[model samples]
Target: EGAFYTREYRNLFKEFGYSEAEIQERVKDTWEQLFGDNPETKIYYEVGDDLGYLLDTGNLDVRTAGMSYGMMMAVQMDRKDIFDRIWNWTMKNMYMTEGVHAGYFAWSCQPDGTKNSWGPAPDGEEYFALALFFASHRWGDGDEQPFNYSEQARKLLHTCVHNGEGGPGHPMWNRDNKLIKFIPEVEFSDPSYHLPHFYELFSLWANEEDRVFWKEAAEASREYLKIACHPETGLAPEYAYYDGTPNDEKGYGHFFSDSYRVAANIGLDAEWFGGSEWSAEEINKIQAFFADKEPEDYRRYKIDGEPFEEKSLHPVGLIATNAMGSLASVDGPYAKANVDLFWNTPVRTGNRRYYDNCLYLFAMLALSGNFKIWFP
Candidate 1:
């Protein structure tokens, strides 16, 4: 029987004819700009000897999103020290213990390690679990709580699906449907959270009893994405109901900031697991949608692809993600064009650098085929 992760890996950049030298140079430059001592878009900072944090510069807060993202980046780069530091900071500051939200990390916190919100975001939980699992596989786990990466990740995954089984908090997933929710307390989902590639890995690495659940989750998310994204334009709402219809209760139904990830996620899933034709097909639609449009002209849009008057807050990011989407869009006509645009767009600086650069780095890694499972 064929399995997702068992397939031999493919370097999308080389498969698509990108020069190896060019890919390596681009990846190196982006990493340096993000982690080096540059005030522009540098997000990494060391606290003391063995602790560091990735600041959400725009919000001036520490979020599980950035913390987990930093850990993933660190592990991919084979920087175990940096990975441990970020994990330590996250455990010491963000982890919730002794309440309804116990077993979940606080979504946001102040730079001084103060909690900004006690609420948990499932996005953070998922990323944290995947990053921890990767850490354990790449760098053997230790005896401590957070340092016991595999155990810690399994515990978190257990909590995500079982949180509400006999408690006050809600579960992060709709267990019956096997689809992840936007938040533990919510019934809807975010399109970008449909990362089947991660789930495919989780099915193998997670606790044995829960492995089947993760397998079901991967299939569920794949089908969910097809429903959530528009058939023609490939645009997905930031929030959607369990049935894959847009949920506009909080005015989040538009194809905006969070929507950008749908294309990238689909592309990565396709790259890693040979996603159904819909994955590559949707990526083609998204790239084709922006092929003729300039970055400055990027705008907010309805899920069906009608543009609004508002200009995109992070046009360069949109370009980067579009380029990253090319990883699985092997047959796309505009894939190379998107990559060229991304190569020319410099790392974002100034006020909104945090979100833009986070996506930017992920796009860089995906395009360079550096975002891989660091097998032991």
Candidate 2:
């Protein structure tokens, strides 16, 4: 989030119609900030600063690491000049030739765009490709895409779902389903589960091909959610086996800090993030639980005892709660709850990161959307 939420993006679409000269100046300044030099690596944004709160050791790609906020900012702000230049630089600099099995986006790169992290998984690639889809539709001027952006999107989607079933709930379960962490590994069952939503966006602006893609996306996401839906806890398992069973060894019975579930919820919560039939009850329980007990100490009531902060993804569960509350048109309640969590809850351990602020900004934006809502 260091360079992720620059003033340029935050104020982009809002202040429309400056003179061409003014627009050019803004783009030049923004381009340098976005694509210029900084520490953490030879690239623009730092890793931990942009992605999770992990140490910002090097350059993580804007796809997975910087995407949630980055791409949304790109499309919403109509930063076409910056998008076109950065897009070309990424492709030319980061494409891989072998071991990682990728011709798509790399996870990390050098200032010159050399691949720093090769990946067999396509999550980050798909994320960036999705941003591209939005860019073309929202602001593309036809000739701007010297490359077939839609085709690229199609290929990435094909790669993401190539398995007889792709996504978290695919029938086969335990085959290759991850990208590189240290090396290629199956980190999560339904990774990048929300990539298909981008297809729906494409369908709205494009054609039958995009529709077919959306259908595939909807089928996969729905099936995954339907299967993962627990009759008891009402929470989806954090990770499933590639065969679609619970992978208890590396799986979870509860929620995660950030995982595929948020995306999965979007598919399941077709009507809203947490507003749908599946999430409403769980969220209500969460709200009731928090309302009744001190959220900071609610877990003490558990027989297992106070859960470690790391495993406690449910600070009444941030994204899902926000998603649900926003969907329910109860964002004020949701946001008020969030403010309570941030200020009153005691286990944060350290200061929050920039991405944390970006998330909060998005929440505020969602709750007060005279604009498009990312969280809601």
Candidate 3:
């Protein structure tokens, strides 16, 4: 019911295929907690920075997280004021310029609204680029403000200097571009991590003649998807080689190392996690392995924990899976399958996690894959 669920709130449950009355009854529906203004900031009507309730917080991460989703809501709802306020505050304060460590993209900001002056992850930078792109595309449509920010983003992406050769390296650079960890390129790596929206950004800002860069990056990403996913098992690892060769750590190290190699070769429709694909039976073994040792269920933890499942379920993955689901229905009797995840999985109808949720919405909008939600 907050910013994420920008649709007519009254009709959302009916619209998104959920039992409106039941969801309202069951879910506490914490809207104010997520977006309500902080009591201390005196801006009592504004969205609180985060769960921590740090009003006027200088954290760019919070801004980035909120901006990613908020901008979309602004576009969909035609609320330019919300987009303008966030942009003004972020641009004036959050833009990271020169330093002993000169990084172009703005990192997190401090409580006083100054740049955080710490290391910024490549993904975070990508998000900024995305936010600017979205701002330009949706809200900034005719304004120079979006154009300027979008150009800044383009320069940042072009000069990444990650040097790994395949895709972009994980963490891009561990110690500020000094080190490049080029693992076989995990599903998390495919640039799809940020590529989907990057394309959307470029597609929107690019002129007819200048669109190649964006298209190239997108095609490269799709190729990466084809190469990284195993044709046999339909499994995809958290990481793998671009050429599809097994990791040198094969059979010589821990059990997962080998498993990762095996999974790297999984087919696109293979159930990577959750009981979703025909190949789910094969994939479930790994999930079970994690479940067996899965710790107190920390989603961030990979092996002994839930291992942030959101990235895999990223809207792109979700739509891709749904397409596979529909195709599988017609594919035949030999396709060993399990649960029907794409259509049946309980996706948050409203915007809950905006950082990634917005991208999902964008990809669906772009029609990269097929997925639809029917609200009553």
Highest TM-score against the true fold, candidate: 1
Top candidate when judged by lDDT against the true structure: 1
Please provide, for model 2 over 1-376, each residue's C-alpha lDDT reduced to its tens digit, 9 standing for 90 to 100: 1111221122221222234454354334333433345221112242322121112122223334443245544455565554555555555655554553554455665444455666533445545656656665565435534345655555555544443343322211223322112113444454324333444453443345445555555446545555554444334444554444454574354444343235323422333222455444444433443454454443312211224344342443343234323332233234345333432322211223223333333332332221232210
> Considering lDDT, which of the candidate structures 2 and 3 is the better prediction for this target?
2
RMSD (Cα, Å) of model 2: 9.7
Each prediction's Cα lDDT score? 0.84, 0.40, 0.36
Could you arrange the candidates by lDDT from highest to lowest? Answer: 1, 2, 3
lDDT at position 340, candidate 1: 73
Model 1 steric clash pairs = none
Better of 1 and 3 by lDDT: 1
Give the alpha carbon lDDT tens digit for every residue of 1-376 in model 1: 1124564545566766778998788788887888878888798888889899988887899999899889888888888989999999999999998678888999999988999888888888888899988888887898877699999999999988788777898889899999998988778899988888888888988888889999999999988998998988888999999989888888789888888888888777777777566767888889888877878899999988899999887777778778888876766888878877877889999877877888888888877767777554
Every model's TM-score = 0.95, 0.59, 0.47
Error of 3 at 172 (Å): 8.1
In candidate 3, what are the lDDT values of residues 1-376, reduced to their tens digit?
1111332122222333546455443222222322344232121123343212122222123443344345433433344566555655555565555442243334455545655554444544555555555555554444465346557555555544332445333224222212212321232242123243245335445444435555555445445545544444333444344453333343211122212323212222221111224333434443333333322232322332334443332332333232233222223232222122222333233222332233323322212111111111
Query: In model 2, what is the error at residue 42, expressed in angstroms?
Result: 17
